[PDB]
Amino acid sequence: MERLAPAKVNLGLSVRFRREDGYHELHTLFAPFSLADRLVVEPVSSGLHFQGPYGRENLAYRAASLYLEAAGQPGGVRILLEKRIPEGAGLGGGSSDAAQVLLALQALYPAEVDLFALARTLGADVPFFLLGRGAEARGVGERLKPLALPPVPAVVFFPGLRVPTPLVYRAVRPEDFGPDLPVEAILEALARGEEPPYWNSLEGPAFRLFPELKEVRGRMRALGLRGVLMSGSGSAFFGLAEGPDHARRAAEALRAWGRAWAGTLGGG
Template identity: 50%
Template structure:
């Protein structure tokens, strides 16, 4: 019996450190990054239908093959040999092109939801990698050290950590961010993951880095303003996530994170602000 409509949560992620070790001959970059899912994200509704249909609420996004959710559904239905369709409603709550992995998470969540809706012997990780380098991470359901081009994932235990996200309303193309880094030749060494995790456990300033941050900030001054605003709100260890433009900083408690988020929302009414925890 085919199950009825269901809602699934698609978590955002942050990079608790992103090192770019170099660039390959094929143009892809070698990464060393600690990726962590969060308690904030998008929601997607799935219901059996006679064909594949996608609706988007909360953002002006395409609803055809240009949308990663649509392509993920196409890929799964084709691989599973499903003759039916599905109606998907994407409730977009995360800002676009913001370094939070929203599109990749939405795609991974679509694969997982359709695997429950239409069970079949399908290689989900292979489908995910075909959709994008970050998509396989969101199949794991936890933090992971990402290496290679992002496809080599090692689960890592990260202590639950409260934090605040702040997006100054700037969209940054990941392709541009990596191109700017390569042009500057500013590649970085591997992360010291042990030191990073130890600092998180002790609630200390975290010695992480984002190799993409300097060149992105140089071209988008509002991101520097967001990083400074997080510190002024009493948070620590501010960093840009991924290719930006969302920045985050860590809090000592959930209460501090909630209070800082309220303060920042009042000071910057045009910016997207959210309190969250690592999941």
């Protein structure tokens, strides 16, 4: 079986306050983006044979192991993961990989396994990717409500500036806290091709600590992209294009400074 595991971007991210539990309450939109890892998943008589980054620590490996356990060890599987999405950049490739492995095994080895229970065990964004569409999220990003997003042309850019993800959160200050995102107005702005009334509260600390990031945004703005945001905790950025040729040409120009892809954001 072949599968495609699409990326996501956070189409706006607002840090609402610090919770009684010490994490930050978010309000954020998750939008699928068409850049996708390719997975080949095939049943075999025995064993779990996995090729991809991180070996046994890969979320998709853990997904397969959990599934086969839940299903009463119905047989083996061979999984090949070909990465197209950069890792640890706010794009959710690993979570998407794991979702597709769950869905593939569900088809290959039906056994009334509760995929969402497994996905919540795996955590991160696996429950989101199982939905196959956009979502509005609260809590720490895990409390989901489905959201229909208009499909629009977009560009994702990866500058190669990795820091541990807790850093950007530890750097957040009360002065960075925002209101809820105006969800309907953001959707309207996407469909109308306007500048969306969104923000990413994490850009507060991130641009203060890493001024290189403002240069990334400026470069994307100069190519005509609208609504340029760092995606979640970063460091990937996205921007909205006027049309598919514009997305392609802006992505091509950005390759001078890093990795870029033209695609579609939203769609379900």
